[PDB]
């Protein structure tokens, strides 16, 4: 019942234990009794008094085994014995470590920084199912990064209107059609009538080109539907499906891992809604924490960020989160980072050079925005990237790629 | 493509439109071009240039029709035409209004304050399914508030250990056994073996007492399981099921509405994880926003807060959020607020007097904490409440209720 | 009839070491083995399903490697894969091996148990699956 | 590939490991190279030579960490790292520890004596369902 028992700065935690690192600021408590309480809460809570103490209560405790001070507050690292989790249910994990823990009156601020799972906890998660690898195999791109475009405007397109601009985009060299996070199903573009259409356009284009083309379609919605729509996307044959992991919810992603197990569907995530906590640096959940829970259940792409005036994104953090996603990790296969952030033909070389050929560059803007129309906007971006990778001067590339020249030349006429 | 078209402070929005009120602080933009962008983002995003504009793009726009300044920033109120939602999928609603909207570089802070749904959007939501009403009918309590206890410690109890203390708690007068937000299923207390047990204990106690007793059991976990466990709780007969709405996820709650439709299961929500955004007053999502999305899909109880030194909770906000939950609202039946916050026999009268007999008072502590053991702790709390309601002086009540006296007398020996 | 060998004996290899290979690592050495002239990939009696080589992800892979190799060679190639485990799973995994097309499935008859083999006869009836047995555990009495 | 690497009488095995105690009689091998082989067999078998060694092969090893002599033979106790089992499938467990292990030519006799499962292996088993209790 003593938040202090929950701390011991000396303790050494074993291979088979769960560690969560926290950022906090007490608020009328010793930095010890704050960090005590974070592990009271996240595990057997309190009480040591009246009724028969539960056997295994005693072994179910959490323990602060490091609390140094950092910035205007401190970092604790609390280690957790696995009798506290239900292995497999990452959703249950969070109830203890992302719960009431953020409400507790004794803290001014509390942020979840990162967490590491003992094999024994993580060998129960399938990891991505395609990873950078699988994805890579199937579309057919061994080296460059993957290119993908959400079309502007972002809604109200009809089933028809949608095919057309899809067709254009795939046609100049885009890899991935991306729907917009918001865009699911509407009277004028119903899901079912949509799938039926695009897929056929999709193939006609493989046929037309020689290259592969996929559509990160947006199955977000109550699980039932998300399932029902996945079974259709599987039907006309897509090896992909876009899901708003933050929106959509946890329990619900899980389930969907399994479903994509089943149909052989590559998940793409879209953090649209994360900004509600992954932002404030004193409180919340680090975009990394989350890029992890979720690489573990198994998403095969996630939006992280960029290298562009538009997303002036902490390149230290952006490269942390990235490098993780891409890193080995036992059995869990590597994820693709998704470069979202108003990018365009000219930012290619620096983007790359700063984040590896292993990216899904997403640049809706720089492409719909081409002066010559979306389809030369995709030739652009394509060339802008072939030439980056092969070393070649963007100004040289331009000398053979006219939609590249005019895109370069044009993005010139916009900044003064 | 002009964040300004997205504003018009003059506009008047019709019955059949969707209004979201925001709190924000620009960050290198006019308070107009900030609030322009919040409705660029939350609806057809940008662009008015190259390819065929989508018909209905034009009618799918959002519009700031009020932006006064408030505190160190401003309040916009953006109104939304329904061609933008997929009616029914509240989860899709949030992708537009709780999305990327919190990430946009031009704001320092952005908070979702409240939202109102035109009949036409809300007539597609079932509301609670039991509401204060149904719940009230079934347990059998027409007047007092409902009492419920999570047992301390909060984990590692065995299937057995659990029955016993359950038995005790129901036995002094508790209405609701509550599991702990964290507590699902574990080697030593597996779900299935748990349900089987408690229910029988539950009834034995109805039999023993004359009163009703239920168990807000905790079906949180991936949807599949949450479903599978709901079907069992339905099986041995419970009209209740506890779910961590914030954890668990949105899409996933939805689905579960429907499932509880089916089995005739009353949902109880537990915001454990909300503190990640519902806290910071400049950024996030107001506990009210959320108490709404979720009364609408239909939870029949939610944790809000209190009137006690322990949760020194903005009584203006706590009473907002409450009063809402309890308020008429067409077709949506009223929700019960859940009073969580280390409360105990002596805070009863003031608690009440400040929040109506219509509460589910949750006080795990004040009850397990009784000096005489948990079961007289429930007599306490019971009496503490009968006497509050009937006017009677707590010191008078004590004169006939010994476990009340000794609890009053004892909570005396703790504050100096 | 099916593998295609009317006269010689059938050749088959369990790879050393016998565990901890990944879904990947496994394809590669499979590929090699089929490639010099092996008929049968054999799993090891112990080798079923593990975090780093899960069954389902395994089947999907190898089979494709299997065929690529038929294509590459001109000869047939099969994989005495190891569906041992509680019946339910053994069934569920047989239905997949059937799925990507294998006419074989390795089972530890002594381990696995009797009642359980039986049932599986019938299941392989059904999918058209050739059983291979592995007496690993018999030495407890047959000695 | 050295049955000897599979032994170390000094080693100390952790909470999260699996121990099987054996009774045996070698038969043309040191009581060490007999008990080496019992853990070669029951885990990554053999070979350290030609093709790419599998990553986790190395961590999937078993290890004799006690072999005293007992009766006309000896008792080894081999401890096993869980990357070798498929948790839940006790049937798979036995293929490694009750397998070919009883056939190996280098032993005259081999008996499985007892085994202890680390929580982490046993928390995946439901135990009886009624026990003396329920029945009762």
PDB file of N, CA and C in Angstrom, chain B residues 347-410:
ATOM      1  N   UNK B 347     -18.312  10.552   2.415  1.00  0.00           N
ATOM      2  CA  UNK B 347     -18.552  11.500   1.375  1.00  0.00           C
ATOM      3  C   UNK B 347     -19.955  11.261   0.812  1.00  0.00           C
ATOM      4  N   UNK B 348     -20.648  10.112   0.986  1.00  0.00           N
ATOM      5  CA  UNK B 348     -22.027   9.993   0.428  1.00  0.00           C
ATOM      6  C   UNK B 348     -22.911  11.298   0.345  1.00  0.00           C
ATOM      7  N   UNK B 349     -23.404  11.845   1.503  1.00  0.00           N
ATOM      8  CA  UNK B 349     -24.265  13.039   1.370  1.00  0.00           C
ATOM      9  C   UNK B 349     -23.785  14.213   0.480  1.00  0.00           C
ATOM     10  N   UNK B 350     -22.564  14.629   0.658  1.00  0.00           N
ATOM     11  CA  UNK B 350     -22.205  15.665  -0.213  1.00  0.00           C
ATOM     12  C   UNK B 350     -22.165  15.285  -1.731  1.00  0.00           C
ATOM     13  N   UNK B 351     -21.713  14.048  -2.026  1.00  0.00           N
ATOM     14  CA  UNK B 351     -21.556  13.456  -3.372  1.00  0.00           C
ATOM     15  C   UNK B 351     -22.810  13.547  -4.097  1.00  0.00           C
ATOM     16  N   UNK B 352     -23.812  13.016  -3.337  1.00  0.00           N
ATOM     17  CA  UNK B 352     -25.189  12.953  -3.798  1.00  0.00           C
ATOM     18  C   UNK B 352     -25.803  14.239  -4.121  1.00  0.00           C
ATOM     19  N   UNK B 353     -25.903  15.010  -3.008  1.00  0.00           N
ATOM     20  CA  UNK B 353     -26.427  16.353  -2.946  1.00  0.00           C
ATOM     21  C   UNK B 353     -25.816  17.145  -4.077  1.00  0.00           C
ATOM     22  N   UNK B 354     -24.562  16.940  -4.433  1.00  0.00           N
ATOM     23  CA  UNK B 354     -23.963  17.589  -5.611  1.00  0.00           C
ATOM     24  C   UNK B 354     -24.167  16.982  -7.036  1.00  0.00           C
ATOM     25  N   UNK B 355     -24.443  15.628  -7.107  1.00  0.00           N
ATOM     26  CA  UNK B 355     -24.781  14.899  -8.372  1.00  0.00           C
ATOM     27  C   UNK B 355     -26.048  13.935  -8.614  1.00  0.00           C
ATOM     28  N   UNK B 356     -27.107  14.131  -7.813  1.00  0.00           N
ATOM     29  CA  UNK B 356     -28.375  13.435  -8.090  1.00  0.00           C
ATOM     30  C   UNK B 356     -28.459  12.009  -7.626  1.00  0.00           C
ATOM     31  N   UNK B 357     -29.616  11.346  -7.386  1.00  0.00           N
ATOM     32  CA  UNK B 357     -29.534   9.958  -6.885  1.00  0.00           C
ATOM     33  C   UNK B 357     -29.030   9.079  -8.099  1.00  0.00           C
ATOM     34  N   UNK B 358     -28.865   9.742  -9.229  1.00  0.00           N
ATOM     35  CA  UNK B 358     -28.547   8.952 -10.351  1.00  0.00           C
ATOM     36  C   UNK B 358     -27.228   9.037 -10.698  1.00  0.00           C
ATOM     37  N   UNK B 359     -26.519   8.085 -10.036  1.00  0.00           N
ATOM     38  CA  UNK B 359     -25.078   7.747 -10.043  1.00  0.00           C
ATOM     39  C   UNK B 359     -24.779   6.349  -9.802  1.00  0.00           C
ATOM     40  N   UNK B 360     -23.684   5.855 -10.376  1.00  0.00           N
ATOM     41  CA  UNK B 360     -23.174   4.546  -9.919  1.00  0.00           C
ATOM     42  C   UNK B 360     -21.887   5.036  -9.162  1.00  0.00           C
ATOM     43  N   UNK B 361     -21.963   4.866  -7.839  1.00  0.00           N
ATOM     44  CA  UNK B 361     -20.903   5.284  -7.002  1.00  0.00           C
ATOM     45  C   UNK B 361     -20.144   4.093  -6.972  1.00  0.00           C
ATOM     46  N   UNK B 362     -18.887   4.301  -7.281  1.00  0.00           N
ATOM     47  CA  UNK B 362     -17.807   3.340  -7.242  1.00  0.00           C
ATOM     48  C   UNK B 362     -16.751   3.714  -6.214  1.00  0.00           C
ATOM     49  N   UNK B 363     -16.615   2.942  -5.120  1.00  0.00           N
ATOM     50  CA  UNK B 363     -15.671   3.292  -4.112  1.00  0.00           C
ATOM     51  C   UNK B 363     -14.851   2.150  -3.608  1.00  0.00           C
ATOM     52  N   UNK B 364     -14.186   1.259  -4.478  1.00  0.00           N
ATOM     53  CA  UNK B 364     -13.330   0.056  -4.100  1.00  0.00           C
ATOM     54  C   UNK B 364     -12.652   0.136  -2.719  1.00  0.00           C
ATOM     55  N   UNK B 365     -11.868   1.267  -2.627  1.00  0.00           N
ATOM     56  CA  UNK B 365     -11.178   1.752  -1.411  1.00  0.00           C
ATOM     57  C   UNK B 365     -12.077   1.799  -0.115  1.00  0.00           C
ATOM     58  N   UNK B 366     -12.843   2.866   0.051  1.00  0.00           N
ATOM     59  CA  UNK B 366     -13.669   2.977   1.249  1.00  0.00           C
ATOM     60  C   UNK B 366     -14.362   1.684   1.727  1.00  0.00           C
ATOM     61  N   UNK B 367     -14.449   0.687   0.816  1.00  0.00           N
ATOM     62  CA  UNK B 367     -15.066  -0.519   1.228  1.00  0.00           C
ATOM     63  C   UNK B 367     -14.146  -1.625   1.625  1.00  0.00           C
ATOM     64  N   UNK B 368     -13.086  -1.957   0.847  1.00  0.00           N
ATOM     65  CA  UNK B 368     -12.055  -3.013   1.192  1.00  0.00           C
ATOM     66  C   UNK B 368     -11.225  -2.611   2.469  1.00  0.00           C
ATOM     67  N   UNK B 369     -11.184  -1.267   2.520  1.00  0.00           N
ATOM     68  CA  UNK B 369     -10.590  -0.456   3.579  1.00  0.00           C
ATOM     69  C   UNK B 369     -11.388  -0.486   4.907  1.00  0.00           C
ATOM     70  N   UNK B 370     -12.668  -0.767   4.889  1.00  0.00           N
ATOM     71  CA  UNK B 370     -13.242  -0.870   6.183  1.00  0.00           C
ATOM     72  C   UNK B 370     -12.370  -1.873   7.100  1.00  0.00           C
ATOM     73  N   UNK B 371     -12.138  -1.411   8.398  1.00  0.00           N
ATOM     74  CA  UNK B 371     -11.467  -1.869   9.614  1.00  0.00           C
ATOM     75  C   UNK B 371     -12.136  -3.142   9.993  1.00  0.00           C
ATOM     76  N   UNK B 372     -13.431  -3.216   9.744  1.00  0.00           N
ATOM     77  CA  UNK B 372     -14.165  -4.437  10.044  1.00  0.00           C
ATOM     78  C   UNK B 372     -14.088  -5.519   8.849  1.00  0.00           C
ATOM     79  N   UNK B 373     -13.407  -5.190   7.662  1.00  0.00           N
ATOM     80  CA  UNK B 373     -13.258  -6.156   6.523  1.00  0.00           C
ATOM     81  C   UNK B 373     -14.200  -5.680   5.378  1.00  0.00           C
ATOM     82  N   UNK B 374     -14.033  -6.210   4.127  1.00  0.00           N
ATOM     83  CA  UNK B 374     -14.906  -5.681   3.097  1.00  0.00           C
ATOM     84  C   UNK B 374     -16.402  -5.895   3.319  1.00  0.00           C
ATOM     85  N   UNK B 375     -16.802  -6.987   3.944  1.00  0.00           N
ATOM     86  CA  UNK B 375     -18.217  -6.993   3.927  1.00  0.00           C
ATOM     87  C   UNK B 375     -19.050  -5.977   4.797  1.00  0.00           C
ATOM     88  N   UNK B 376     -18.411  -5.409   5.848  1.00  0.00           N
ATOM     89  CA  UNK B 376     -19.143  -4.475   6.654  1.00  0.00           C
ATOM     90  C   UNK B 376     -18.863  -3.151   5.945  1.00  0.00           C
ATOM     91  N   UNK B 377     -17.878  -3.147   5.051  1.00  0.00           N
ATOM     92  CA  UNK B 377     -17.552  -1.923   4.323  1.00  0.00           C
ATOM     93  C   UNK B 377     -18.634  -1.597   3.332  1.00  0.00           C
ATOM     94  N   UNK B 378     -19.319  -2.662   2.885  1.00  0.00           N
ATOM     95  CA  UNK B 378     -20.427  -2.557   1.975  1.00  0.00           C
ATOM     96  C   UNK B 378     -21.534  -2.239   2.915  1.00  0.00           C
ATOM     97  N   UNK B 379     -21.748  -2.836   4.074  1.00  0.00           N
ATOM     98  CA  UNK B 379     -22.948  -2.299   4.850  1.00  0.00           C
ATOM     99  C   UNK B 379     -22.867  -0.805   5.057  1.00  0.00           C
ATOM    100  N   UNK B 380     -21.650  -0.423   5.293  1.00  0.00           N
ATOM    101  CA  UNK B 380     -21.330   0.992   5.507  1.00  0.00           C
ATOM    102  C   UNK B 380     -21.884   1.876   4.439  1.00  0.00           C
ATOM    103  N   UNK B 381     -21.101   1.838   3.402  1.00  0.00           N
ATOM    104  CA  UNK B 381     -21.416   2.537   2.212  1.00  0.00           C
ATOM    105  C   UNK B 381     -22.905   2.479   1.872  1.00  0.00           C
ATOM    106  N   UNK B 382     -23.616   1.444   2.361  1.00  0.00           N
ATOM    107  CA  UNK B 382     -25.008   1.274   1.925  1.00  0.00           C
ATOM    108  C   UNK B 382     -25.859   2.182   2.610  1.00  0.00           C
ATOM    109  N   UNK B 383     -25.603   2.255   3.935  1.00  0.00           N
ATOM    110  CA  UNK B 383     -26.254   3.019   4.955  1.00  0.00           C
ATOM    111  C   UNK B 383     -25.912   4.431   4.882  1.00  0.00           C
ATOM    112  N   UNK B 384     -24.667   4.599   4.513  1.00  0.00           N
ATOM    113  CA  UNK B 384     -24.117   5.946   4.370  1.00  0.00           C
ATOM    114  C   UNK B 384     -24.994   6.563   3.288  1.00  0.00           C
ATOM    115  N   UNK B 385     -25.284   5.808   2.230  1.00  0.00           N
ATOM    116  CA  UNK B 385     -26.200   6.293   1.199  1.00  0.00           C
ATOM    117  C   UNK B 385     -27.709   6.224   1.560  1.00  0.00           C
ATOM    118  N   UNK B 386     -28.290   5.163   2.155  1.00  0.00           N
ATOM    119  CA  UNK B 386     -29.739   5.188   2.475  1.00  0.00           C
ATOM    120  C   UNK B 386     -29.830   6.515   3.315  1.00  0.00           C
ATOM    121  N   UNK B 387     -29.152   6.600   4.487  1.00  0.00           N
ATOM    122  CA  UNK B 387     -29.292   7.768   5.331  1.00  0.00           C
ATOM    123  C   UNK B 387     -29.069   8.987   4.464  1.00  0.00           C
ATOM    124  N   UNK B 388     -28.138   9.064   3.488  1.00  0.00           N
ATOM    125  CA  UNK B 388     -28.039  10.434   2.803  1.00  0.00           C
ATOM    126  C   UNK B 388     -29.317  10.811   2.178  1.00  0.00           C
ATOM    127  N   UNK B 389     -29.788   9.974   1.310  1.00  0.00           N
ATOM    128  CA  UNK B 389     -31.003  10.149   0.591  1.00  0.00           C
ATOM    129  C   UNK B 389     -32.212  10.502   1.364  1.00  0.00           C
ATOM    130  N   UNK B 390     -32.457   9.773   2.461  1.00  0.00           N
ATOM    131  CA  UNK B 390     -33.603  10.020   3.382  1.00  0.00           C
ATOM    132  C   UNK B 390     -33.371  11.295   4.334  1.00  0.00           C
ATOM    133  N   UNK B 391     -32.373  12.120   4.007  1.00  0.00           N
ATOM    134  CA  UNK B 391     -32.134  13.318   4.762  1.00  0.00           C
ATOM    135  C   UNK B 391     -31.209  13.080   5.908  1.00  0.00           C
ATOM    136  N   UNK B 392     -31.476  12.035   6.729  1.00  0.00           N
ATOM    137  CA  UNK B 392     -30.757  11.676   7.966  1.00  0.00           C
ATOM    138  C   UNK B 392     -29.247  11.896   8.180  1.00  0.00           C
ATOM    139  N   UNK B 393     -28.958  12.485   9.339  1.00  0.00           N
ATOM    140  CA  UNK B 393     -27.642  12.880   9.750  1.00  0.00           C
ATOM    141  C   UNK B 393     -26.832  11.676   9.830  1.00  0.00           C
ATOM    142  N   UNK B 394     -25.698  11.791   9.154  1.00  0.00           N
ATOM    143  CA  UNK B 394     -24.747  10.688   9.111  1.00  0.00           C
ATOM    144  C   UNK B 394     -24.360  10.082  10.530  1.00  0.00           C
ATOM    145  N   UNK B 395     -24.472  10.956  11.518  1.00  0.00           N
ATOM    146  CA  UNK B 395     -24.138  10.680  12.872  1.00  0.00           C
ATOM    147  C   UNK B 395     -25.284  10.031  13.528  1.00  0.00           C
ATOM    148  N   UNK B 396     -26.403  10.130  12.845  1.00  0.00           N
ATOM    149  CA  UNK B 396     -27.619   9.520  13.352  1.00  0.00           C
ATOM    150  C   UNK B 396     -27.684   8.154  12.783  1.00  0.00           C
ATOM    151  N   UNK B 397     -27.408   8.111  11.476  1.00  0.00           N
ATOM    152  CA  UNK B 397     -27.428   6.830  10.793  1.00  0.00           C
ATOM    153  C   UNK B 397     -26.624   5.817  11.564  1.00  0.00           C
ATOM    154  N   UNK B 398     -25.456   6.320  12.059  1.00  0.00           N
ATOM    155  CA  UNK B 398     -24.339   5.619  12.783  1.00  0.00           C
ATOM    156  C   UNK B 398     -24.681   4.965  14.115  1.00  0.00           C
ATOM    157  N   UNK B 399     -25.738   5.607  14.657  1.00  0.00           N
ATOM    158  CA  UNK B 399     -26.381   5.268  15.919  1.00  0.00           C
ATOM    159  C   UNK B 399     -27.210   3.890  15.827  1.00  0.00           C
ATOM    160  N   UNK B 400     -27.536   3.474  14.586  1.00  0.00           N
ATOM    161  CA  UNK B 400     -28.267   2.229  14.249  1.00  0.00           C
ATOM    162  C   UNK B 400     -27.305   1.338  13.400  1.00  0.00           C
ATOM    163  N   UNK B 401     -26.379   1.969  12.626  1.00  0.00           N
ATOM    164  CA  UNK B 401     -25.358   1.265  11.768  1.00  0.00           C
ATOM    165  C   UNK B 401     -23.897   1.296  12.272  1.00  0.00           C
ATOM    166  N   UNK B 402     -23.578   0.286  12.998  1.00  0.00           N
ATOM    167  CA  UNK B 402     -22.304   0.078  13.564  1.00  0.00           C
ATOM    168  C   UNK B 402     -21.125   0.045  12.507  1.00  0.00           C
ATOM    169  N   UNK B 403     -21.216  -0.751  11.419  1.00  0.00           N
ATOM    170  CA  UNK B 403     -20.151  -0.748  10.415  1.00  0.00           C
ATOM    171  C   UNK B 403     -20.240   0.769   9.841  1.00  0.00           C
ATOM    172  N   UNK B 404     -21.369   1.512   9.969  1.00  0.00           N
ATOM    173  CA  UNK B 404     -21.293   2.910   9.439  1.00  0.00           C
ATOM    174  C   UNK B 404     -20.434   3.692  10.449  1.00  0.00           C
ATOM    175  N   UNK B 405     -20.850   3.669  11.748  1.00  0.00           N
ATOM    176  CA  UNK B 405     -20.141   4.354  12.913  1.00  0.00           C
ATOM    177  C   UNK B 405     -18.621   4.148  12.790  1.00  0.00           C
ATOM    178  N   UNK B 406     -18.168   2.922  13.115  1.00  0.00           N
ATOM    179  CA  UNK B 406     -16.787   2.532  12.995  1.00  0.00           C
ATOM    180  C   UNK B 406     -16.053   2.924  11.655  1.00  0.00           C
ATOM    181  N   UNK B 407     -16.740   3.492  10.678  1.00  0.00           N
ATOM    182  CA  UNK B 407     -16.149   3.825   9.316  1.00  0.00           C
ATOM    183  C   UNK B 407     -15.863   5.322   8.996  1.00  0.00           C
ATOM    184  N   UNK B 408     -16.661   6.012   9.810  1.00  0.00           N
ATOM    185  CA  UNK B 408     -16.904   7.411   9.997  1.00  0.00           C
ATOM    186  C   UNK B 408     -15.829   7.672  11.025  1.00  0.00           C
ATOM    187  N   UNK B 409     -16.069   7.116  12.245  1.00  0.00           N
ATOM    188  CA  UNK B 409     -15.191   7.169  13.427  1.00  0.00           C
ATOM    189  C   UNK B 409     -13.722   6.906  12.978  1.00  0.00           C
ATOM    190  N   UNK B 410     -13.529   5.847  12.204  1.00  0.00           N
ATOM    191  CA  UNK B 410     -12.209   5.466  11.667  1.00  0.00           C
ATOM    192  C   UNK B 410     -11.628   6.466  10.607  1.00  0.00           C
TER     193      UNK B 410
END
